[PDB]
Amino acid sequence: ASSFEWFGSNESGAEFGSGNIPGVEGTDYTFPNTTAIQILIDAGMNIFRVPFLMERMIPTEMTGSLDTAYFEGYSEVINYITGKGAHAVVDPHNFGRYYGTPISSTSDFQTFWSTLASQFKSNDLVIFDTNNEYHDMDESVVVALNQAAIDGIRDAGATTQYIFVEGNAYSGAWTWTTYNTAMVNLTDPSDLIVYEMHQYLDSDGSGTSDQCVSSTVGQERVVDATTWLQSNGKLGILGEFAGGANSVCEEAVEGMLDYLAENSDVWLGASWWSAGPWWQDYIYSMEPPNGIAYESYLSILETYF
Ligand SMILES: *[C@@H]1O[C@H](CO)[C@@H](O[C@@H]2O[C@H](CO)[C@@H](O[C@@H]3O[C@H](CO)[C@@H](O)[C@H](O)[C@@H]3O)[C@H](O)[C@H]2NC(C)=O)[C@H](O)[C@H]1NC(C)=O
């Protein structure tokens, strides 16, 4: 049946227009469309990562209360996903920063995470994602923020959910051993840590180009991260990946997913970047019915569902 435990998609919109905080719904940001989500569920996708902004969720100070409108619109999406039996990944899409400044106190972060997790604590299908793509920060501080997220989450009473932790250097697979070897030390009472890495297939590994450097680069860029997972006895999920709608990229995505599936003892699954209702013309749009990656990649991806 399934090549992995999890295969699915990011659902973007709540994190758009981050230059506008709080911003206005329908103008600067939107929430994902549950009808399109249901289309992806019917196709067989069982995990959806949902980005949002920390500043819109808990304004002013991350130790404060939740914004009612933003939490309501967001958790409507989360509860739609889990109500259908799929996993919903709660993604603070904040790059380790809060109002632009790198986060530097584990207490405020932990209190943020208690406040947020308390709202989902009895939902076994929610997955908490500590922060999207830490980058250009002190590695020991990145580790400490992942640990503070774990601590705040479990202390909120949310002990049955998986926790996706993310590394420095944009949590890239192809650079994991270069930058995030120190991520081993993370501890969870529930023992439900999964190392979420991201991988794109263009020259700089950012994905801003819809060109892939070769038809085998996807496979090459995940070998070291795989052996790192095995050697240290860790689990991982490729929480973001994508490729341009051309043959070389399609073959690279195929080979990378074949390799990861061969090592499904440590690789728990994958999610495409990205779906959602405001991607019209995006090079990687998984949004049905007419997204480019939905038209060109769905038939490839559904092999692994
Ligand atoms: C949320 O997602 C739903 C489901 O995709 C959106 O509804 C759909 O909107 C599209 C575009 O307006 C409709 O597309 C058309 O379909 C017919 C063929 O059936 C085709 O002749 C046209 O060329 C075009 O492809 C689609 O039928 C429609 N589906 C349903 C069930 O209404 C909806 O607009 C989205 N709402 C948002 C973004 O908030």
Coordinates of C-alpha atoms and ligand atoms in Angstrom, one line a residue:
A1 CA 0.0 0.0 0.0
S2 CA 1.5 3.3 1.2
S3 CA 5.2 3.8 0.5
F4 CA 5.4 6.0 3.7
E5 CA 3.3 6.7 6.8
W6 CA 2.5 10.2 5.4
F7 CA 2.1 11.7 2.0
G8 CA 0.5 15.1 1.4
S9 CA 0.8 18.8 1.0
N10 CA 1.4 22.2 2.5
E11 CA -1.7 24.4 2.5
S12 CA -0.6 28.1 2.3
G13 CA -2.4 31.4 2.7
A14 CA -2.5 32.3 6.4
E15 CA 1.2 33.3 6.1
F16 CA 0.9 35.4 3.0
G17 CA 1.7 39.2 3.0
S18 CA 3.9 39.0 6.1
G19 CA 4.8 42.6 5.5
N20 CA 1.3 43.5 6.8
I21 CA 0.9 42.7 10.5
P22 CA -1.8 42.0 11.7
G23 CA -3.0 42.6 8.1
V24 CA -6.5 42.0 6.8
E25 CA -8.0 38.7 5.9
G26 CA -9.0 38.5 2.2
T27 CA -6.5 41.3 1.5
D28 CA -3.1 40.3 2.9
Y29 CA -3.7 36.6 3.8
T30 CA -6.4 34.0 3.5
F31 CA -7.1 30.7 5.0
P32 CA -6.9 27.5 3.0
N33 CA -10.0 26.2 1.1
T34 CA -11.4 23.0 2.7
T35 CA -13.1 22.0 -0.5
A36 CA -9.7 21.8 -2.3
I37 CA -8.2 20.1 0.7
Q38 CA -11.0 17.5 0.4
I39 CA -10.1 17.0 -3.2
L40 CA -6.5 16.2 -2.1
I41 CA -7.9 13.9 0.6
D42 CA -10.0 12.0 -1.9
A43 CA -6.9 11.6 -4.1
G44 CA -5.3 9.9 -1.1
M45 CA -3.3 12.5 0.7
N46 CA -3.3 12.0 4.5
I47 CA -1.1 14.9 5.9
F48 CA -1.4 18.7 5.4
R49 CA 1.0 21.3 6.8
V50 CA -0.7 24.6 7.5
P51 CA 1.6 27.7 7.8
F52 CA 0.6 30.7 9.9
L53 CA 2.4 33.8 11.3
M54 CA 3.2 33.9 15.1
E55 CA 2.6 37.6 15.1
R56 CA -1.0 37.2 13.8
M57 CA -1.6 34.2 16.1
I58 CA -0.3 35.8 19.4
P59 CA 0.2 39.5 18.8
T60 CA 2.5 42.0 20.5
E61 CA 4.3 39.6 22.8
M62 CA 4.5 35.9 22.2
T63 CA 3.6 35.4 25.9
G64 CA 0.2 37.0 25.3
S65 CA -3.3 35.7 24.4
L66 CA -4.5 34.4 21.1
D67 CA -6.1 36.6 18.4
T68 CA -9.7 35.2 18.4
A69 CA -10.4 35.8 14.7
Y70 CA -7.0 34.4 13.5
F71 CA -7.1 31.4 15.7
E72 CA -10.7 30.7 14.8
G73 CA -10.1 30.8 11.0
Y74 CA -6.9 28.8 11.4
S75 CA -8.3 26.1 13.7
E76 CA -11.3 25.7 11.4
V77 CA -8.8 24.4 8.8
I78 CA -6.9 22.3 11.3
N79 CA -10.2 20.7 12.7
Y80 CA -11.5 20.1 9.1
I81 CA -8.3 18.2 8.3
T82 CA -8.2 16.1 11.5
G83 CA -12.0 15.6 11.4
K84 CA -11.6 13.8 8.1
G85 CA -9.0 11.5 9.7
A86 CA -5.8 13.1 8.3
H87 CA -2.9 14.7 10.2
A88 CA -2.7 18.5 10.4
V89 CA 0.7 20.1 10.9
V90 CA 0.6 23.4 12.8
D91 CA 3.4 25.4 11.2
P92 CA 4.6 28.7 12.7
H93 CA 6.0 30.0 9.5
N94 CA 8.4 32.4 11.1
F95 CA 12.1 31.4 10.3
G96 CA 13.0 31.5 13.9
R97 CA 12.1 35.3 14.1
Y98 CA 9.4 37.3 15.8
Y99 CA 8.6 40.8 14.4
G100 CA 11.8 40.3 12.4
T101 CA 14.2 39.7 15.3
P102 CA 15.7 36.2 15.9
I103 CA 14.0 34.6 18.9
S104 CA 16.4 34.7 21.9
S105 CA 14.4 33.7 25.0
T106 CA 13.3 30.1 25.4
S107 CA 10.8 31.1 28.0
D108 CA 8.7 33.3 25.7
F109 CA 8.9 30.7 23.0
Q110 CA 7.8 27.9 25.4
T111 CA 4.9 30.1 26.7
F112 CA 3.9 30.7 23.1
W113 CA 3.9 27.0 22.5
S114 CA 1.9 26.2 25.7
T115 CA -0.7 28.8 24.7
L116 CA -1.0 27.4 21.2
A117 CA -0.8 23.7 22.0
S118 CA -3.4 23.9 24.9
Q119 CA -5.9 24.6 22.2
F120 CA -5.2 21.2 20.4
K121 CA -4.0 19.1 23.3
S122 CA -6.7 16.4 23.1
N123 CA -6.5 16.1 19.3
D124 CA -4.3 13.1 18.5
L125 CA -4.0 14.0 14.8
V126 CA -2.5 17.4 15.2
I127 CA 1.3 17.6 14.6
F128 CA 3.2 20.5 16.1
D129 CA 6.0 22.1 14.0
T130 CA 8.4 24.1 16.2
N131 CA 9.2 26.7 13.6
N132 CA 9.6 26.9 9.8
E133 CA 13.2 27.0 8.6
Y134 CA 15.4 28.5 11.3
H135 CA 18.3 30.3 9.6
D136 CA 21.3 32.5 10.3
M137 CA 21.1 32.0 14.1
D138 CA 23.3 30.4 16.7
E139 CA 23.0 26.6 16.3
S140 CA 22.9 26.1 20.0
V141 CA 20.1 28.6 20.2
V142 CA 18.2 26.8 17.4
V143 CA 18.5 23.6 19.4
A144 CA 17.4 25.4 22.6
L145 CA 14.3 26.8 20.8
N146 CA 13.3 23.3 19.6
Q147 CA 13.7 22.0 23.1
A148 CA 11.6 24.9 24.6
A149 CA 8.9 24.2 22.0
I150 CA 8.8 20.5 23.0
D151 CA 8.7 21.4 26.7
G152 CA 5.9 24.0 26.3
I153 CA 3.9 21.6 24.2
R154 CA 4.1 18.6 26.6
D155 CA 3.5 20.9 29.6
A156 CA 0.4 22.2 28.0
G157 CA -1.0 18.7 28.2
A158 CA -0.4 17.8 24.6
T159 CA 1.5 14.6 25.0
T160 CA 0.1 12.3 22.3
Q161 CA 0.9 14.4 19.3
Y162 CA 4.1 14.1 17.2
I163 CA 6.4 17.1 17.2
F164 CA 8.2 18.1 14.0
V165 CA 11.5 19.8 14.8
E166 CA 13.4 21.9 12.3
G167 CA 17.1 22.7 12.0
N168 CA 19.2 25.8 11.1
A169 CA 20.1 26.6 7.5
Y170 CA 16.5 26.3 6.4
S171 CA 16.4 22.7 7.6
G172 CA 17.8 21.5 4.3
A173 CA 18.4 17.8 3.9
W174 CA 21.4 18.3 1.5
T175 CA 23.2 20.3 4.2
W176 CA 22.0 18.6 7.4
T177 CA 25.3 17.0 8.4
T178 CA 27.0 20.3 7.6
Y179 CA 24.9 22.5 9.9
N180 CA 22.6 20.5 12.2
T181 CA 24.6 17.6 13.7
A182 CA 23.9 19.2 17.1
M183 CA 20.1 18.5 16.7
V184 CA 20.6 15.0 18.1
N185 CA 20.2 16.1 21.7
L186 CA 16.5 16.8 21.6
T187 CA 14.4 15.0 24.2
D188 CA 10.7 14.3 24.4
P189 CA 8.9 12.6 27.4
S190 CA 6.3 11.3 24.9
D191 CA 9.2 10.3 22.7
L192 CA 7.6 11.5 19.4
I193 CA 10.3 13.6 17.8
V194 CA 10.5 13.6 14.0
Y195 CA 13.3 15.6 12.2
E196 CA 11.5 17.6 9.5
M197 CA 13.9 18.5 6.7
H198 CA 13.2 20.4 3.4
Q199 CA 14.7 19.7 0.0
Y200 CA 14.5 21.6 -3.3
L201 CA 16.3 20.5 -6.5
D202 CA 17.6 23.7 -8.0
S203 CA 21.2 25.2 -7.9
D204 CA 20.8 26.9 -4.5
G205 CA 18.3 24.4 -3.0
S206 CA 15.8 27.2 -2.4
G207 CA 13.4 26.2 -5.1
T208 CA 13.1 29.7 -6.6
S209 CA 14.0 28.2 -9.9
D210 CA 11.7 25.6 -11.6
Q211 CA 14.9 24.1 -13.1
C212 CA 16.6 21.0 -11.5
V213 CA 20.4 20.7 -11.7
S214 CA 20.1 17.0 -12.9
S215 CA 17.7 14.1 -12.9
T216 CA 19.6 12.5 -10.0
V217 CA 20.2 15.4 -7.7
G218 CA 17.2 14.7 -5.5
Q219 CA 18.6 11.3 -4.7
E220 CA 22.1 12.6 -4.1
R221 CA 20.9 15.4 -1.8
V222 CA 19.2 13.0 0.7
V223 CA 21.8 10.2 1.2
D224 CA 23.8 11.9 4.0
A225 CA 20.6 13.0 5.8
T226 CA 19.3 9.4 5.6
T227 CA 22.5 7.8 7.0
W228 CA 22.4 10.5 9.7
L229 CA 18.9 9.4 10.7
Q230 CA 19.8 5.7 10.7
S231 CA 23.1 6.1 12.6
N232 CA 21.6 8.2 15.3
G233 CA 18.4 6.2 15.4
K234 CA 16.1 9.2 14.5
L235 CA 13.0 9.6 12.4
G236 CA 12.5 12.1 9.6
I237 CA 9.9 13.6 7.4
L238 CA 10.5 15.6 4.2
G239 CA 8.1 18.4 5.1
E240 CA 8.7 20.5 2.0
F241 CA 9.8 19.5 -1.5
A242 CA 8.9 20.4 -5.1
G243 CA 10.2 20.6 -8.6
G244 CA 9.4 22.3 -11.8
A245 CA 6.9 20.9 -14.3
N246 CA 9.5 19.5 -16.7
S247 CA 10.9 16.1 -17.4
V248 CA 14.3 16.4 -15.7
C249 CA 12.6 17.6 -12.5
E250 CA 9.9 15.0 -12.6
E251 CA 12.6 12.3 -12.9
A252 CA 14.6 13.8 -10.0
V253 CA 11.5 13.9 -7.7
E254 CA 10.8 10.3 -8.7
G255 CA 14.3 9.1 -7.8
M256 CA 14.4 11.0 -4.5
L257 CA 11.1 9.6 -3.4
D258 CA 12.1 6.1 -4.5
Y259 CA 15.3 6.3 -2.3
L260 CA 13.3 7.7 0.6
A261 CA 10.8 4.9 0.3
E262 CA 13.6 2.4 0.3
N263 CA 14.6 3.9 3.6
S264 CA 11.1 4.2 5.1
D265 CA 12.4 2.8 8.4
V266 CA 13.6 6.3 9.1
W267 CA 11.7 8.4 6.5
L268 CA 8.1 8.7 7.7
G269 CA 6.8 10.5 4.6
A270 CA 6.7 13.7 2.6
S271 CA 4.6 16.8 1.8
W272 CA 4.7 18.9 -1.3
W273 CA 5.2 22.7 -1.4
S274 CA 2.6 24.0 -1.9
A275 CA -1.2 24.0 -2.2
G276 CA -3.7 26.7 -1.3
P277 CA -6.1 29.2 -3.0
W278 CA -3.7 32.1 -3.6
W279 CA -1.0 30.3 -5.7
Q280 CA -2.6 31.1 -9.1
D281 CA 0.3 30.7 -11.6
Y282 CA 2.8 29.6 -9.0
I283 CA 5.5 27.2 -10.4
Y284 CA 4.6 24.6 -7.8
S285 CA 0.9 25.0 -7.2
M286 CA -0.7 21.7 -6.0
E287 CA -4.1 23.4 -5.7
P288 CA -6.8 21.6 -7.7
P289 CA -8.2 21.6 -10.2
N290 CA -5.8 23.7 -12.4
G291 CA -2.5 24.1 -10.4
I292 CA 0.6 23.4 -12.4
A293 CA 2.0 20.9 -10.0
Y294 CA -1.4 19.4 -9.5
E295 CA -1.8 18.8 -13.2
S296 CA 1.8 17.6 -13.8
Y297 CA 2.8 15.8 -10.5
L298 CA -0.4 14.3 -9.0
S299 CA -0.1 11.2 -11.2
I300 CA 3.5 10.7 -10.0
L301 CA 2.9 11.4 -6.4
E302 CA -0.2 9.2 -6.1
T303 CA 2.0 6.1 -6.7
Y304 CA 3.3 6.5 -3.2
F305 CA 0.0 7.2 -1.4
Ligands
LIG1 C1 -12.5 26.2 -3.1 O1 -12.3 25.1 -3.9 C2 -13.4 24.8 -4.8 C3 -13.2 23.4 -5.5 O2 -12.1 23.6 -6.4 C4 -13.6 25.9 -5.8 O3 -14.7 25.6 -6.6 C5 -14.5 25.3 -8.0 O4 -14.1 26.5 -8.7 C6 -13.7 26.3 -10.0 C7 -13.3 27.6 -10.7 O5 -14.3 28.6 -10.5 C8 -14.7 25.5 -10.9 O6 -14.0 25.2 -12.1 C9 -14.6 24.9 -13.4 O7 -15.1 23.6 -13.6 C10 -15.8 23.3 -14.8 C11 -15.9 21.8 -15.0 O8 -16.5 21.1 -13.9 C12 -15.0 23.8 -16.0 O9 -16.0 23.8 -17.1 C13 -14.4 25.1 -15.9 O10 -13.5 25.3 -17.0 C14 -13.7 25.2 -14.6 O11 -12.6 24.2 -14.6 C15 -15.1 24.2 -10.2 O12 -16.2 23.6 -10.9 C16 -15.6 24.6 -8.8 N1 -16.0 23.4 -8.0 C17 -17.1 23.4 -7.2 C18 -17.4 22.1 -6.6 O13 -17.7 24.4 -7.0 C19 -13.9 27.2 -5.0 O14 -14.1 28.3 -5.8 C20 -12.8 27.5 -4.0 N2 -13.2 28.6 -3.1 C21 -12.3 29.4 -2.6 C22 -11.0 29.5 -3.3 O15 -12.4 30.0 -1.5

